[PDB]
Amino acid sequence: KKGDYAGGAVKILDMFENGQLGYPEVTLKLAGEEANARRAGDERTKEAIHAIVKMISDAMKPYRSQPIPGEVIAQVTSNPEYQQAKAFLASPATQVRNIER
């Protein structure tokens, strides 16, 4: 609910994986959550979103609005660091921490 920027990021990430979002829409939207997290002092949430934004940006470099290529979705979602960051943002502890702030 209110102030749950981690949860909001996970919703964006789910849309990214479904092909629903394009580039740079996905990173601009994640950056928005990341700024919300920064303003609220959800420091770990900010950092997790930042790591994901970097991964997506980097994977899009060879492809420099547009839909995300299937190859990029596959590469990113297969990256263990991405999986860890998304799970962290999705985790109860993180979401509660965000709501409590």
Interacting residues with Cl ion (CB under 5 A): 38, 42-46, 55, 59, 75-76, 79, 97
Give one word for 3, left, alpha or beta, with left for phi > 0 and alpha for psi -120 to 50: left
The single-letter DSSP state of residue 22 is E
Q: Which is nearer to Cl ion, 29 or 72 (CB)?
A: 72
**Which residues neighbour 70 within 8 Å (Cβ) at sequence distance 6 or greater?**
19
Q: Which is nearer to Cl ion, 51 or 55 (CB)?
A: 55
- What minimum distance in Å lies between the beta carbon of 92 and Cl ion? 12
Which structure tokens are listed for 61? 């470099």
- What minimum distance in Å lies between the beta carbon of 5 and Cl ion? 8
Which structure tokens are listed for 99? 């709501």
- What minimum distance in Å lies between the beta carbon of 89 and Cl ion? 9
Q: Which is nearer to Cl ion, 4 or 42 (CB)?
A: 42
